[model samples]
Target: ACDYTCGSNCYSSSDVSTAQAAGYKLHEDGETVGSNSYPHKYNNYEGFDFSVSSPYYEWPILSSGDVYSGGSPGADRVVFNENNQLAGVITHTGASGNNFVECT
Candidate 1:
């Protein structure tokens, strides 16, 4: 079963964990990838209710089951914090413009 659904893509808890780990690693080392510079700061402009602390970051979560390296980031993302805690899964599927909506 899908642990989280982002548009047409389906993700499990393990998938979220894998993506989070990769993103958090680069954040800890002060490194970033891709053109838009992923794993970057994610300001809570949408004001989604998150249990984790502030200062969140966003990283791409690919549907191909491979970690995001560089290039297109698709629509889905894994949001995490400095403490390596998952904030949530969000996507640009339903939201307008460049905004994101949380995965259900």
Candidate 2:
């Protein structure tokens, strides 16, 4: 008699009810993340200028308020103005998966 090892496979399934729940449809498209919520109120010198400067530097302003300056040059930028308001320069490239700002 030839010696041989045999393997057996077994599986089982159970029937479950297809339950559905209703709630607020949290619909947030990619546009929402990249969308400009606040307009750029301050001018080039008023707000955080990402054109030619380092980020995270606090620039004092008189009218609107002081602004926390910082951002990726030519890429991403954020500005917190004098009135303790926040704004920024958002350039949406329309790239897939890169369109939305990550919000928790």
Candidate 3:
């Protein structure tokens, strides 16, 4: 069964953790990749009321079962906080424009 679903894509806890770890490592190193520079501030404009604290960052969680390095960042993302805590998974699939909707 799917732990989380984003449009046509699906993910599990391990996937989120792996992606989160890589992103957080770059975050700690003050580095970024991709055209938009991932591991960047998330801003939380949607205000989803995450369990973890703010000052969050967003990193691509690829549906291909691979951690993000530097390429097309797909629609799904794993948001994490400064403490390296998983905030949640979000996607641009259902939301309009660049806005994001929480993955179920």
Candidate 4:
């Protein structure tokens, strides 16, 4: 069986543009929970700017402390805080279809 997964990424103005230029899709509606491809992994953001691309381009809300992806079978939430410039990711991990796994 395939594992379902979801997450989000926060992006600055220039980083968002770079992802777009690289053919990375952007999340249109702000404050909306969007569905991204499953089993996706992302790297940590170093600094603000156009230096890196959005961790998950398809997720919605590109602001600091933005929430993306939730309520799916294997969903997760990722938050980026501009104040301390840190990202917090919450994911559900375990055997596939295990109901005990949950993200709070």
Taking the tens digit of each residue's C-alpha lDDT, what string does model 1 give over 11-93? 99999999999999999899999999988999999999999998999999999999999999999999999899999999999
TM-score of model 4 vs. true structure: 0.22
Worst 10 residues of 2 by lDDT: 15-24
Q: Best by lDDT, which number?
A: 1
lDDT of 2 by residue, 2-86 (tens): 1111112111111000000000011112111113322133344434334443222122111112121222222223333333333
Write one digit per residue (lDDT tens) for candidate 3, span 63-89: 999888899999999999999999999
lDDT of 4 by residue, 1-104 (tens): 11222233333445433323322221232233325442234443323232334453222222342333343423333333322122333343442552222222
lDDT scores in order: 0.95, 0.22, 0.93, 0.32
Best-fitting candidate, measured by TM-score?
A: 1
Clashes of each: 0, 6, 0, 1
| Candidate 3, residue 82: how far the Cα is off, in Å | 0.3
Worst 10 residues of 3 by lDDT: 40-49
After TM-score superposition, the amount by which residue 15's alpha carbon in candidate 3 deviates from its true location, in angstroms, is 0.6
Show the colliding residue pairs in model 4.
65-80
After best superposition, candidate 4 residue 93: deviation in angstroms? 1.7
* lDDT for position 23 in model 4: 25
- So what's the TM-score on candidate 2? 0.19
* Total residue pair clashes for candidate 2: 6
Q: What order do you get sorting by lDDT, best first?
A: 1, 3, 4, 2
